[PDB]
Amino acid sequence: YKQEYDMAADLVRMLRGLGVFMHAKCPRCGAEGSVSIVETKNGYKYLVIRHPDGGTHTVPKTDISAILKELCEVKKDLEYVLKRYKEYEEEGGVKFCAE
């Protein structure tokens, strides 16, 4: 559980740094909110849901299904964007990385 939780937390961290929108049903409230991470003073990152009125709830390590579902959707969106980059370089002749 802790492994799976930290890998999810690590992805959410990376995506949040990029600006990537993520939303999920909170395991605690039932309410929709934004998926984020919090870092304890000791350097451990855990997952939370921030509900649009400010309320934030910790995601239990045994219940990350809704977070994994959203990470799945994000993964597909990023795959699609990269497929288009590949198309525009290989079929379109665009050299995005001038080299």
Residues within window 18-77 making contact with Zn ion, judged by CB under 5 A: 26, 28-29, 57
Q: Please identify which residue in the block is written with the tokens 């910790």.
A: 58
Smallest gap from residue 7 Cβ to a second copy (A)? 4
Q: Which does 26 bind (CB under 5 to 8 A by kind): Zn ion, a second copy, none?
A: Zn ion
CB closer to a second copy, 22 vs 26 = 22
- The span from the first CA to the last CA of the chain, in angstroms, equals 43
| Alpha helical stretches, state H, 44-93 | 65-86
Q: What share of the chain is helix, strand, coil (3-state, %, to 5)?
A: 45, 20, 35
| Residues within the interface to a second copy (CB under 8 A) | 3-4, 7-8, 10-11, 14-15, 18-21, 65, 68-69, 71-72, 75-82, 84-85, 88, 92-98
